[PDB]
Amino acid sequence: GSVQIVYKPVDLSKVTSKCGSLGNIHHKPGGGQVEVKSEKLDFKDRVQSKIGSLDNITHVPGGGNKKIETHKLTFRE
Amino acid sequence: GSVQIVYKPVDLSKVTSKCGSLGNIHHKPGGGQVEVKSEKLDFKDRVQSKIGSLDNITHVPGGGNKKIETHKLTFRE
Amino acid sequence: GSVQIVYKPVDLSKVTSKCGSLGNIHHKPGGGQVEVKSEKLDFKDRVQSKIGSLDNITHVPGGGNKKIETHKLTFRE
Amino acid sequence: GSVQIVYKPVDLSKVTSKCGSLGNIHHKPGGGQVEVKSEKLDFKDRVQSKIGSLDNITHVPGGGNKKIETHKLTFRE
Amino acid sequence: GSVQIVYKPVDLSKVTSKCGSLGNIHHKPGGGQVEVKSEKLDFKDRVQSKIGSLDNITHVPGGGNKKIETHKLTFRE
Amino acid sequence: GSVQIVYKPVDLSKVTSKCGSLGNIHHKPGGGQVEVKSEKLDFKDRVQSKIGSLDNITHVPGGGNKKIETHKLTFRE
Amino acid sequence: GSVQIVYKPVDLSKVTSKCGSLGNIHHKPGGGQVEVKSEKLDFKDRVQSKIGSLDNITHVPGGGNKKIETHKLTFRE
Amino acid sequence: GSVQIVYKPVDLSKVTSKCGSLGNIHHKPGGGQVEVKSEKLDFKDRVQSKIGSLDNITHVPGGGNKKIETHKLTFRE
Amino acid sequence: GSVQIVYKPVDLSKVTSKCGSLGNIHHKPGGGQVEVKSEKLDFKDRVQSKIGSLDNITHVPGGGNKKIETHKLTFRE
Amino acid sequence: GSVQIVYKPVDLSKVTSKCGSLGNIHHKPGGGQVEVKSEKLDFKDRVQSKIGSLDNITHVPGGGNKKIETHKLTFRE
């Protein structure tokens, strides 16, 4: 009982974009107020906690195109 | 009892976009007020918690196109 | 008892869009007030909690096209 | 008792859109008031909770076209 | 007792739309008031809860066309 | 023709008040929205105008007693 | 023709008040939104104008008693 | 024609107040938003204008008693 | 025609107040946003203008008692 | 025609206050945002202008008692 397996995917996808002119942006946040209180903290695993923050972000790329691709093969007996 | 398996997907998808001119944007947030209170905290797994935040974000890409693709093959006996 | 399996999907889909001019946007939020209270917190799994937030977001892409695609094959005996 | 299986779907779908000019938008929210109270919190599974929020969002893409597609094949004995 | 199966769907669907000019929009919400109270909270499954919110959304795409498609084949013995 | 005038008012008025305990007060207003528009403004006198306001006041005195008294005498010929 | 005038008012008024304990007060206003527009402004007199304000006041005196008194005499010929 | 004038007012007024204990006060205002627009401004007199303000005041005296008194005499011929 | 004038007012007024203990006060303002626009400004008199301010005040005296008194005499011929 | 004038006011007013203990005060303001714009400025008189400010004041006296008094006499012919 022999087994033959072939795995030949093919991709030619393209992702493009065009933009002429870009700018003239203003971002003005006026302060804030935050307060937290806690007593016990215990994490034992793949944890990604984040406590008590005040953040301002300006993310302006000229491009901004993303592509994700995964393959997986599993054989058992 | 032999087994033959062929796996040959094909893709030629395209994702494009065009834009002439882009800008002239204003973003002005006026403050806030936040308060939290807790006693016990215990996570043991793939956790993604986030407690007590005040955030402002401006995300202005010129492109902004996304593409996700996954393949999976499993064989058992 | 032999088994023959062929898996040959084909795609040529396209996703495009055009836009001439884009801008002249205003966003002005005037504050707020938030308060939470809790005693016990215990998560042990793939959890995505989020407690006590005050957020402002401006998401203005020039493109903004999305495409999701998945394939899966399972064989058992 | 042999088995023959063929799987050959074909797609040529297209999704497009056009827009000349776009802008001149105003968004002005005037504050609020929120208060929550709880004692016990225990999640153990794929949970997506969200407690006590005050959010403002402006999502203005130039494109905005979406396409979802899934395939699945299962064989048992 | 052999079995022959053929699976060859074909699609050529198209989804388009046109729009000349678009804008001149105002959105002004004047505050609010919310209060919740609870004692016990226990979820163990694929849950999507959301408690105590005050939200404002402006979703103005230039395109806005959507397309969903699924295929499934199951074989048993 | 002589004139005699006597002006001898007498007052012994008293204004008192008692209060044992006082407190435990909450005041939580949730925002608003106001807009005015005008072109011409001309005042020439003892004017006390007030245009376009959003006010919150908490006036909690422990006493709060008031007393007004005026006298006037006029002689002509 | 002689004139005799006597002006002898007498006052013994008292204004008192008592209070045992006083406190435990909360004041939490959640934001707002105001906008005004005008073109011409001309005042020439004892004017007390006030345009375009957003105010919050907490006035908590321990006493708070007030007393006003005026006298006036006028003689003409 | 001689004139005799006597002006002998007498006052013994008292203004008091008592308070045992005083405190435990909270004041938390959450932001705001104000905008004004004008072109011409011309005042020529005793003017007390005030334009475009955002104020927060906490006025907590231990005493707080006030007393106003005026006298005036005028003679003409 | 001789004139005799006597001006002998007498005052013994007292203003007092007592307070045992005083404190435990909190004041937390969370930001703001202000914008003004004007073109012409011309004052020629006793003017007390004030334009475009953002102020926070905490005025906590232990005493706080006030007393105003004026006298005036005018003679003409 | 001789004239006799006597001006003998008498005052014995007292202003006192007592306070046992005083303190434990917090003052925490969280930022702000201010912007002004003007073109012409011309004052020629006793003017007291004040433009474009952001101020924080803590005025905590142990005493705080005030007393104002004026006298005036005018003679004409």
Curated annotation (Swiss-Prot), chains A, B, C, D, E, F, G, H, I, J:
Outcome of substituting V34M: In FTD1; ultrastructural and biochemical characteristics indistinguishable from Alzheimer disease; accelerates aggregation of tau into filaments
Record-listed cross-link Glycyl lysine isopeptide (Lys-Gly) (interchain with G-Cter in ubiquitin), residues: K8, K14, K18, K28, K40, K44, K50, K66, K72
Chain positions of Tau/MAP repeats: 3-33, 34-65
Post-translational modification: Phosphorylation at serine and threonine residues in S-P or T-P motifs by proline-directed protein kinases (PDPK1, CDK1, CDK5, GSK3, MAPK) (only 2-3 sites per protein in interphase, seven-fold increase in mitosis, and in the form associated with paired helical filaments (PHF-tau)), and at serine residues in K-X-G-S motifs by MAP/microtubule affinity-regulating kinase (MARK1, MARK2, MARK3 or MARK4), causing detachment from microtubules, and their disassembly. Phosphorylation decreases with age.
Site (Not glycated): K8, K14, K18, K28, K37, K40, K67, K72
Residues recorded with modification N6,N6-dimethyllysine: K8
Domain remark from Swiss-Prot or TrEMBL: The tau/MAP repeat binds to tubulin. Type I isoforms contain 3 repeats while type II isoforms contain 4 repeats.
Function noted in UniProt: Promotes microtubule assembly and stability, and might be involved in the establishment and maintenance of neuronal polarity. The C-terminus binds axonal microtubules while the N-terminus binds neural plasma membrane components, suggesting that tau functions as a linker protein between both. Axonal polarity is predetermined by TAU/MAPT localization (in the neuronal cell) in the domain of the cell body defined by the centrosome. The short isoforms allow plasticity of the cytoskeleton whereas the longer isoforms may preferentially play a role in its stabilization.
Recorded disease: In Alzheimer disease, the neuronal cytoskeleton in the brain is progressively disrupted and replaced by tangles of paired helical filaments (PHF) and straight filaments, mainly composed of hyperphosphorylated forms of TAU (PHF-TAU or AD P-TAU). O-GlcNAcylation is greatly reduced in Alzheimer disease brain cerebral cortex leading to an increase in TAU/MAPT phosphorylations.
Assembly behavior: Interacts with MARK1, MARK2, MARK3 and MARK4. Interacts with PSMC2 through SQSTM1. Interacts with SQSTM1 when polyubiquitinated. Interacts with FKBP4. Binds to CSNK1D. Interacts with SGK1. Interacts with PIN1. Interacts with LRRK2. Interacts with LRP1, leading to endocytosis; this interaction is reduced in the presence of LRPAP1/RAP.
Protein name: Microtubule-associated protein tau
Species: Homo sapiens (Human)
Lineage of source species: Eukaryota, Metazoa, Chordata, Craniata, Vertebrata
Shown stretch of the complete protein: 621 to 697 of 758
